[PDB]
Design a protein around this ligand. Sequence first.
Ligand SMILES: Nc1ncnc2c1ncn2[C@@H]1O[C@H](COP(=O)(O)OP(=O)(O)OP(=O)(O)O)[C@@H](O)[C@H]1O
Ligand SMILES: Nc1ncnc2c1ncn2[C@@H]1O[C@H](COP(=O)(O)OP(=O)(O)OP(=O)(O)O)[C@@H](O)[C@H]1O
Ligand SMILES: Nc1ncnc2c1ncn2[C@@H]1O[C@H](COP(=O)(O)OP(=O)(O)OP(=O)(O)O)[C@@H](O)[C@H]1O
Ligand SMILES: Nc1ncnc2c1ncn2[C@@H]1O[C@H](COP(=O)(O)OP(=O)(O)O)[C@@H](O)[C@H]1O
Ligand SMILES: Nc1ncnc2c1ncn2[C@@H]1O[C@H](COP(=O)(O)OP(=O)(O)O)[C@@H](O)[C@H]1O
Ligand SMILES: Nc1ncnc2c1ncn2[C@@H]1O[C@H](COP(=O)(O)OP(=O)(O)O)[C@@H](O)[C@H]1O
Ligand SMILES: [Mg+2]
Ligand SMILES: [Mg+2]
Ligand SMILES: [Mg+2]
Lengths: 137, 137, 137, 137, 137, 137
Amino acid sequence: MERTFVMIKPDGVRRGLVGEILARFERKGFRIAALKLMQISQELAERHYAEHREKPFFPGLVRFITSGPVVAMVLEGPGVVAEVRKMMGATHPKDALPGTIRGDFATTIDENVIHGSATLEDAQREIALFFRPEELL
Amino acid sequence: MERTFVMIKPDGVRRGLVGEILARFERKGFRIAALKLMQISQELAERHYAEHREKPFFPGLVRFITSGPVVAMVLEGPGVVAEVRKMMGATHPKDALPGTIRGDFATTIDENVIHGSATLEDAQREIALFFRPEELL
Amino acid sequence: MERTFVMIKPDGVRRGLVGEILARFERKGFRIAALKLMQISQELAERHYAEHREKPFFPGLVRFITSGPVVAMVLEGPGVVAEVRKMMGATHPKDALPGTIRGDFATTIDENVIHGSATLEDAQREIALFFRPEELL
Amino acid sequence: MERTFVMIKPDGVRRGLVGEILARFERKGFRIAALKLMQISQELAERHYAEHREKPFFPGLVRFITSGPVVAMVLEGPGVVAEVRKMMGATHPKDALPGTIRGDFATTIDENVIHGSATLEDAQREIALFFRPEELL
Amino acid sequence: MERTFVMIKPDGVRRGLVGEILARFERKGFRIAALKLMQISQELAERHYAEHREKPFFPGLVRFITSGPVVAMVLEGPGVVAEVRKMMGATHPKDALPGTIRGDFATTIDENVIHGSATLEDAQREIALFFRPEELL
Amino acid sequence: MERTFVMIKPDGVRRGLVGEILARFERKGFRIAALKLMQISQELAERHYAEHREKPFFPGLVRFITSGPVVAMVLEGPGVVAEVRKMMGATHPKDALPGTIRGDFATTIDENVIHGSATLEDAQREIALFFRPEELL
Ligand SMILES: Nc1ncnc2c1ncn2[C@@H]1O[C@H](COP(=O)(O)OP(=O)(O)OP(=O)(O)O)[C@@H](O)[C@H]1O
Ligand SMILES: Nc1ncnc2c1ncn2[C@@H]1O[C@H](COP(=O)(O)OP(=O)(O)OP(=O)(O)O)[C@@H](O)[C@H]1O
Ligand SMILES: Nc1ncnc2c1ncn2[C@@H]1O[C@H](COP(=O)(O)OP(=O)(O)OP(=O)(O)O)[C@@H](O)[C@H]1O
Ligand SMILES: Nc1ncnc2c1ncn2[C@@H]1O[C@H](COP(=O)(O)OP(=O)(O)O)[C@@H](O)[C@H]1O
Ligand SMILES: Nc1ncnc2c1ncn2[C@@H]1O[C@H](COP(=O)(O)OP(=O)(O)O)[C@@H](O)[C@H]1O
Ligand SMILES: Nc1ncnc2c1ncn2[C@@H]1O[C@H](COP(=O)(O)OP(=O)(O)O)[C@@H](O)[C@H]1O
Ligand SMILES: [Mg+2]
Ligand SMILES: [Mg+2]
Ligand SMILES: [Mg+2]
């Protein structure tokens, strides 16, 4: 029942890591409730990162997240939000532990391969923001 | 430039083979131009099967193809249509060689895990049928 | 010389995770001293979980562990007991770290894919309880 | 329904290929109906080779097949006997195609890592010889 | 005893396929007798291509083979020369079967990821040309 | 720009773990700036472990590191020194976490599969000690 939003960022897609990452989630046992390759519009990127609109890395952040196609998805399963968060590893790749997605695939904070909803509330919000209602199965 | 349509069938999705299959296409070097989880409707299924209509197993097929969500995609690359047919292996798993998708993942023709356009024309037809134009990137 | 008992539970077997899990142990360098697919009898399950006989989840626990075939084994190698315990990860999948067996394959405490002897004493006891003496090589 | 007998030979076991090989059969979709680590006795080995008896390498074979523990198993699935012969590849590794077990893991016919029943009848014969009835699940 | 020369081309190195390719040769059972990252010089490249000289694409080839670092190696094992040609698959990826290196990793003959000695004599010639004697172990 | 020295020890090479380990680094995104199979000379081993020259395990240590060929390399990338150190895991395999190289492949401190420069200074020193200047690309 519980759902979380996940996004394989432009770098992850360009480096051909989509299947590998998705396999980790299926292997874990989560259900794919939604999935799609998509181009983040300038607007979506600004809404999504509104939180950091004042920050100084905001411009470069928006430029990165829209630099290429991303793979958006919604994973379903018991405590999927917290578990997916643990699977991704620390935001700053330098602190992400091995066995973790960022720990195994990312090297810098700027291009950290993936995003996972931080909380239940963030998830509900991100899902409505990235997917159309009928796209959830 | 050349592109093909691929569909991971309901059996492939429920068995959690989506990532593994996508990974093979990515390691091969093909570009993912479109991708999405979707539910095939009765009408849609029947439209896709226009020649296999006056055939027999037609109903039993539609039943399976609509039995659950499928993962649709478009792959791009040199001779990708013929190349993907080769990667999938024979339609009937028993005749598909080890190393191919159906050879390594399927056991019956009923649930042969995946579908790939037979020709460039079939691909164009399938792409227009399963994807909206804006979903192609 | 040191040995530990490991069991891939009914869920792990049903989800086709036996080879993958066994590969992690061979890759680690441990020796397979015993191995067998088996059905846990009502009696064995009760003996094995005697510790939690009074608990409330006992009935459902016994029902799960006997719900289907399991793969029992004995691994041999330096500090194998403690190392195998670390490899499995926390009992409650929610706390199991990525790279860990439960961390990568389990989502709930009820069906946590695998068991590993907790101590040397538990190992000796579990081994005699699950395997016949001549089955150890 | 249909079933076959498979044996990971002593070389396959010592090289730690048990999990990887089992994983291929599991991802393929076959059911594991029996499995066990065992030591083949002199008599047992000779009984298994009844026609190859008046042959030459007979002794050198028995020597190898009894040189260490083997992993015996029974696999179930549609046309599993022929399908497994295809998955193993040619008896002599040099003629086994990449993607098959012997093609990817073996280099000599002497130690060709695995054995699989040649026919349904050979399978029944091998199953009755290597497994007790109660070991079949 | 028998040995062959293998070169992971510039495209294979930049795409980060070195480990995956080496892993296949190791799981196969071949011994690595020599290995090194190197930059092929103009002269060196041309010397390697002595017969393909009066040919056409010669310059376009040298351009690619010297376009970046390559990983050179010598593999040892029974019939390793023919065996490695089989593992690499057809020179042109479109004709290479799934399961082979070029079949699973390449799409164009221009950048077909890897090279392997065609004969024992070519191997000796290539080994003397790319490796100093002391680099053979 | 930053570089670190890594060495797959004799055990790792003998167990055929080179490709697998190298793949983890390419997957991570680091660049291979140098690579070569080599035999550590008595002198090099003594220089490298001069730090522990007084210790009691020194003799056995030198004997191990020179017991067979090793694969030496230099990895390049952002904070590669610290990240590679984290990827390898604790020196004593017993304390190395799963998902970590030693955590997944090593069982004892004596034969712990791999080495990674501890600091920037150690790296510069190890690189000049193991590789010739022209071998860095
Ligand atoms: N006995 C059968 N039982 C169930 N489905 C069958 C049977 N025979 C054929 N099919 C179905 O028929 C279709 C086969 O298509 P066709 O023979 O025209 O070429 P194809 O390359 O296999 O196409 P596809 O990729 O869709 O399988 C598939 O959708 C398959 O599942
Ligand atoms: N030159 C040889 N050296 C060592 N063993 C050999 C040699 N030739 C054949 N063998 C052995 O002979 C047997 C070959 O069996 P056979 O040719 O009847 O069919 P098969 O399908 O290969 O059977 P199997 O699965 O047991 O290998 C194997 O056990 C194999 O190891
Ligand atoms: N159209 C082409 N474009 C670019 N390179 C080509 C083309 N045709 C052939 N080549 C190059 O020609 C060489 C083919 O060698 P050859 O046909 O003699 O046998 P081979 O077994 O393929 O050798 P190799 O392992 O070096 O590819 C390769 O180096 C390949 O990249
Ligand atoms: N130093 C930094 N440079 C660039 N981007 C940063 C930096 N610090 C944080 N960010 C960005 O802000 C966001 C942090 O939010 P959080 O959801 O906790 O992490 P993440 O998005 O990496 O999962 C990410 O989009 C991240 O890239
Ligand atoms: N909340 C719970 N629900 C179901 N089973 C539980 C619960 N808490 C503990 N258990 C069961 O009790 C046992 C705990 O013993 P332990 O050996 O430390 O862990 P595990 O068996 O998971 O390795 C397991 O069989 C586990 O499934
Ligand atoms: N108890 C021990 N037995 C054998 N060798 C040891 C022991 N303790 C330390 N060493 C050796 O000393 C070195 C420790 O240095 P360090 O660079 O921190 O670890 P490592 O080389 O394992 O990465 C290694 O070469 C290690 O094998
Ligand atoms: Mg098809
Ligand atoms: Mg056989
Ligand atoms: Mg070649």
